[PDB]
Design a protein around this motif. Structure first.
Motif, short mmCIF file in Angstrom:
data_model
loop_
_atom_site.label_atom_id
_atom_site.label_comp_id
_atom_site.label_asym_id
_atom_site.label_seq_id
_atom_site.Cartn_x
_atom_site.Cartn_y
_atom_site.Cartn_z
N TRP B 28 5.56 -36.32 -43.29
CA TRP B 28 4.96 -37.19 -44.11
C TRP B 28 4.26 -36.82 -44.92
O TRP B 28 3.76 -35.46 -45.19
CB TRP B 28 4.15 -38.08 -42.97
CG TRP B 28 3.06 -37.38 -42.66
CD1 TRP B 28 1.51 -37.80 -42.89
CD2 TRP B 28 2.83 -36.54 -41.26
NE1 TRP B 28 0.93 -37.13 -42.19
CE2 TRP B 28 1.36 -36.39 -41.20
CE3 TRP B 28 3.63 -35.82 -40.43
CZ2 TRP B 28 0.85 -35.45 -40.33
CZ3 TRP B 28 3.26 -35.17 -39.59
CH2 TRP B 28 1.74 -34.85 -39.37
N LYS B 29 3.82 -37.73 -45.81
CA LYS B 29 2.91 -37.54 -47.15
C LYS B 29 1.53 -38.05 -46.76
O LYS B 29 1.49 -39.31 -46.20
CB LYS B 29 3.59 -38.14 -48.39
CG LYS B 29 2.47 -38.54 -49.76
CD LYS B 29 2.47 -37.07 -50.24
CE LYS B 29 1.35 -37.24 -51.38
NZ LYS B 29 1.04 -35.72 -51.71
N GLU B 30 0.26 -37.46 -47.10
CA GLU B 30 -0.84 -37.84 -47.02
C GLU B 30 -1.38 -38.45 -48.59
O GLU B 30 -1.56 -37.25 -49.19
CB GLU B 30 -1.85 -36.76 -46.46
CG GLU B 30 -1.47 -36.45 -45.02
CD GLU B 30 -2.26 -37.38 -43.99
OE1 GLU B 30 -2.83 -38.30 -44.25
OE2 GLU B 30 -1.76 -37.44 -42.89
N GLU B 31 -1.66 -39.63 -48.58
CA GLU B 31 -2.30 -39.91 -49.85
C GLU B 31 -3.92 -40.04 -49.27
O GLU B 31 -4.28 -41.29 -48.74
CB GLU B 31 -1.98 -41.26 -50.24
CG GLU B 31 -0.63 -41.04 -50.87
CD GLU B 31 -0.57 -40.67 -52.42
OE1 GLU B 31 -1.70 -40.22 -53.02
OE2 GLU B 31 0.48 -40.69 -53.04
N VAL B 32 -4.75 -39.22 -49.84
CA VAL B 32 -6.18 -39.32 -49.64
C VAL B 32 -6.78 -40.15 -50.65
O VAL B 32 -6.71 -39.92 -51.77
CB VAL B 32 -6.63 -37.70 -49.81
CG1 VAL B 32 -8.11 -37.76 -49.48
CG2 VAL B 32 -5.95 -36.69 -48.85
CA CA Z 1 -1.38 -36.31 -51.22
#
Ligand code: CA
Ligand code: GSH
Ligand code: GSH
Ligand code: CA
Ligand code: PT
Ligand code: PT
Ligand code: PT
Lengths: 210, 209
Positions: B28-32
């Motif tokens: 998965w990708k984390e969009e902070v």
């Molecule tokens: Ca990111």
């Protein structure tokens, strides 16, 4: 005997929605009523998983948590979307309903006098998401998710009904929600249930506030 | 898939679903989202209930942490073996959520004055999960049935953060203690829990734990 038993206080409360569901779906069930006196004796409470009601029996399956009961009936009676994607949207709606219900319950039981004005002021912002959901689903002419009723519809309906009692006309700002309440409430089996002494003669909450 | 989780730089309400994804070998990708970006207002206004997490599974966009958990549970087969187990899984998760709500209220609205009463009440709040374990294969497998469910990840997180809040709170509960040790030792989860990605995030957003 019926395979379903609802164990609860003599109030609508967190059982209103699941009762509407069962009635609208033509299912039979038993009501076991727990008085405040019996509750204060403590032995039933100690036997409840999380020390609270409702308790629900489906044969020898014993459940606690109102939303667990709703999801269970949702699964077994086909009120949980037509596929996995709709199921997630149904959950998203119900979790939203539950969030606002918790705020409503907090107001009613812990801060009615001091908190009501602020609550009603904040209320349109809390209802708007459900209007938005309706507007994005067939122009709001059917159900909250997809083209068939789900357990989330019954829970949302209850939420809207009790808020009209708390803040009369709160749905005047939300045409789709207003029509939605009228439409679902007119479903024959549900209309009959809502008019019946079984529903009408119970208070919304346990402390006389609404 | 693919999965994207959109959230503040904290563990919070994404800790459990992250553990689930990691343990299940998912990518998965984390969009902070920084607090500064959040305060700008545009993202918040675009969120269904004005809150994060927001979650993307291909073209499906979800809000509500427990919706995300249940979605992953249903799509990845972490929701019990049948309807009766699914109901028990929900019962556990709703119980976890109830205590998490109390925890969150303490942390963010009443930590200093309220911690003493909270910790005193904690054993009675944890006992139901010990009881559930005791009634399922002697506590030797999972919280419901013989396979892991999304409720396990949520319960595990709940227990871990309470050990931080109240060290030793599981000492009186052997099945819960062993359960934490056992699930935490699962290879992919162990690696995730040890990683900076987890360790170097605070549990909550106000510096309290
Ligand atoms: Ca990111
Ligand atoms: N999360 C639970 C909360 C249930 C709950 O708050 N039950 C209240 C009445 S609605 C209760 O049993 N109060 C008595 C007590 O807590 O001792 C659910 O959704 O059913
Ligand atoms: N019921 C929601 C609650 C989500 C929630 O409380 N989000 C918080 C952070 S964990 C938030 O977005 N705070 C910023 C705001 O409300 O503006 C869920 O389970 O996801
Ligand atoms: Ca499985
Ligand atoms: Pt609540
Ligand atoms: Pt909460
Ligand atoms: Pt709450």
């Amino acid at each position: 005997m019926p395979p379903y038993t609802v164990v609860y206080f003599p109030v609508r409360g967190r059982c209103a929605a699941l009762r509407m569901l069962l009635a609208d779906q033509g299912q039979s069930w038993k009501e076991e009523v727990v008085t405040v006196e019996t509750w204060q004796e403590g032995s039933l409470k100690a036997s409840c998983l999380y020390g609270q009601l409702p308790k629900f029996q489906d044969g020898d399956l014993t459940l606690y948590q109102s939303n667990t009961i709703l999801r269970h009936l949702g699964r077994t009676l086909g009120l949980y979307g037509k596929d996995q994607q709709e199921a997630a949207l149904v959950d998203m709606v119900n979790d939203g309903v539950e969030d606002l219900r918790c705020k409503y319950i907090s107001l009613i039981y812990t801060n009615y006098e001091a908190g009501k004005d602020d609550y009603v002021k904040a209320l349109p912002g809390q209802l708007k998401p459900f209007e938005t959901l309706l507007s994005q689903n067939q122009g709001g002419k059917t159900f909250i998710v997809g083209d068939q009723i789900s357990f989330a519809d019954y829970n949302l309906l209850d939420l809207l009904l009790i808020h009209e009692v708390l803040a009369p006309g709160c749905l005047d700002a939300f045409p789709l929600l207003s029509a939605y309440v009228g439409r679902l409430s007119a479903r024959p089996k549900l209309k009959a249930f809502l008019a019946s002494p079984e529903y009408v003669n119970l208070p919304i909450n346990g402390n006389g506030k609404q």
